[PDB]
Swiss-Prot record:
Transmembrane segments: none annotated. Belongs to the SMARCD family. The chain holds residues 291 to 370 of 515 of the full protein. This is SWI/SNF-related matrix-associated actin-dependent regulator of chromatin subfamily D member 1. It is found in: Nucleus. Involved in transcriptional activation and repression of select genes by chromatin remodeling (alteration of DNA-nucleosome topology). Component of SWI/SNF chromatin remodeling complexes that carry out key enzymatic activities, changing chromatin structure by altering DNA-histone contacts within a nucleosome in an ATP-dependent manner. Belongs to the neural progenitors-specific chromatin remodeling complex (npBAF complex) and the neuron-specific chromatin remodeling complex (nBAF complex).
Length: 93
């Protein structure tokens, strides 16, 4: 755990499949994580088997690709969906 300190906030680029899913072009971690949580809550993606797991919906199943995962594994898969909203070099790939 480590939050910014004087300067632009920690914003992460949302995947092309998520950026739309939630509609969050680019936000922070504590801003996205929520927008997501609000999804499993609203979409009641809560695993019917466990209370700590969450069954990714058709969409999520296409983003996370995890039929069933732990709520604590949500932030572990976000890192993937979360990308650096910054360049690096010309010619991608």
């Amino acid at each position: 755990g480590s939050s910014g300190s004087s300067g632009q906030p920690p914003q992460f680029k949302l995947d092309p499949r998520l950026a739309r899913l939630l509609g969050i072009h680019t936000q922070t971690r504590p801003v996205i994580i929520q927008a997501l949580w609000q999804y499993i809550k609203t979409h009641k993606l809560q695993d019917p088997h466990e209370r700590e797991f969450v069954l990714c919906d058709k969409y999520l199943q296409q983003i996370f690709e995890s039929q069933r995962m732990k709520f604590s594994e949500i932030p572990q898969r976000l890192h993937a969906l979360l990308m650096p909203p910054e360049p690096s070099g010309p010619s991608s790939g």
